[PDB]
Amino acid sequence: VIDPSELTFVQEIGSGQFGLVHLGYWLNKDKVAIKTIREGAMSEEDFIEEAEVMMKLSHPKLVQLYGVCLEQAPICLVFEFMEHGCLSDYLRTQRGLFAAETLLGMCLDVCEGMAYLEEASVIHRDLAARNCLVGENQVIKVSDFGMTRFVLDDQYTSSTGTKFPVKWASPEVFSFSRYSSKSDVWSFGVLMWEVFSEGKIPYENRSNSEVVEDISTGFRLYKPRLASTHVYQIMNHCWKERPEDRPAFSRLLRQLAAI
Ligand SMILES: COc1cc(C)c(Sc2cnc(NC(=O)c3ccc(CN[C@@H](C)C(C)(C)C)cc3)s2)cc1C(=O)N1CCN(C(C)=O)CC1
């Protein structure tokens, strides 16, 4: 638990799934990012349960949750400040400046984070570039793993909802809500596409229904220029119809490191 007096709210930096994000300071010295959880956004008591375990999850390629500020309404989550924001934004902003090796390095970072979560029996559920953050020396860290379990907006959570992230969803997820580390693997493949495409939106921004149809019939994203023949076959292995035909993150890590 972080005491409210230990935090200083400096400036609003944006809004996400659960509401406001501020740049702040922790004990008047260290830069932190503070999520202010908006009313009706979170399943609050259910999260305060899972907060202890989430905090205990620690890895250099996961954005660290430093603590929870509970002694106030609305409650706040205190995070490691990532100096370059979301990967999705970062890729688009820096488009044209990336060497293939740097882009591969980003995929490696994410894969290391996911390998840790997979090992720890944790499903992300919404792995995408928008949910990864960029820190010192372009290091990429995975964030908000498992958080969609606490989202009250049924448009996001339900596979049939209008806000459902179909573009990163494996066939068994969008059809049957069947999550696993292997469904995160599908998402990771799409994230690889995003990285090597320098932040392009997968599936020409096609409708949710059209993507479901595309994937159901066998369509797959085409190779981005900066992705090698080898990288593209790794992507395609992530997009096998059956989750059992997809590699584990532990395997992908060996493959991406071997390059
Ligand atoms: C995936 O969602 C999130 C996950 C985490 C885990 C955190 S906790 C965080 C940890 N670290 C963060 N860093 C940043 O959000 C950031 C953004 C911009 C800049 C560059 N300009 C700075 C210096 C300002 C905005 C002060 C001018 C630097 C850092 S947020 C915040 C969000 C989130 O909701 N947003 C990310 C950042 N946003 C925007 C508009 O960029 C708002 C949505």
CA dist., res. 145 & res. 124, Å (int): 4
Structure solved via: X-ray
Here the CATH number for the domain that contains residue 178 is: 1.10.510.10
Nearest C-alpha to atom 20 of ligand 1 is from which residue?
A: 84
Residue 89, classed as helix, strand or coil, is: helix
Q: How far is the CA of 251 from the centre of ligand 1 (A)?
A: 31
In the sheet that 7-16 helps form, which strands lie side by side, from edge to edge? 7-16, 19-26, 30-36, 76-80, 65-69
Verify that 169 and 180 share a domain, yes or no: yes
Name the domain boundary from 66, 81, 96. Answer: 81
Looking up tokens 């981005």 gives 224
What six digits make up the tokens of 182?
Answer: 């292997």
CB 185 within 8 A of CB 125: no
CA dist., res. 254 & res. 111, Å (int): 10
CA dist., res. 59 & res. 64, Å (int): 8
CB 60 within 8 A of CB 143: no
- Neighbour-count burial for 118-131, b at 16+ CB within 10 Å, e otherwise: beeebbbbbbbbbb
CA dist., res. 144 & res. 64, Å (int): 10
Which residue of 7, 11, 13 sits with most ligand 1 atoms within 8 Å of its CB, as the best mutation to test the pocket? 13
- The data reach a resolution, in angstroms, of 1.9
What six digits make up the tokens of 105?
Answer: 């390095």
Find the catalytic residue in 3, 109, 126, 144. Answer: 126
CB 17 within 8 A of CB 34: no
Distance from the first to the final alpha carbon of the chain: 42
**Helical H runs in the chain?**
44-56, 87-93, 100-119, 154-157, 171-176, 181-196, 208-217, 229-238, 249-258
CA dist., res. 60 & res. 80, Å (int): 11
Element (H, E) at 57: none
CA dist., res. 62 & res. 184, Å (int): 15
CA dist., res. 150 & res. 135, Å (int): 26
Verify that 34 and 162 share a domain, yes or no: no
Verify that 69 and 135 share a domain, yes or no: no
| Residues facing 146 on adjacent strands | none
Helix axes of 229-238 and 181-196: crossing angle, nearest 10 degrees: 150
Nearest C-alpha to atom 34 of ligand 1 is from which residue?
A: 16
**Residue 62: φ, ψ to 5°:** -120, 135
Name the domain boundary from 54, 81, 108. Answer: 81
Element (H, E) at 36: strand 30-36
Can you give the residue range of the structural domain that contains 146? 82-259
Query: Is-catalytic flag, 46?
Result: no
CA dist., res. 98 & res. 246, Å (int): 28
Verify that 135 and 245 share a domain, yes or no: yes
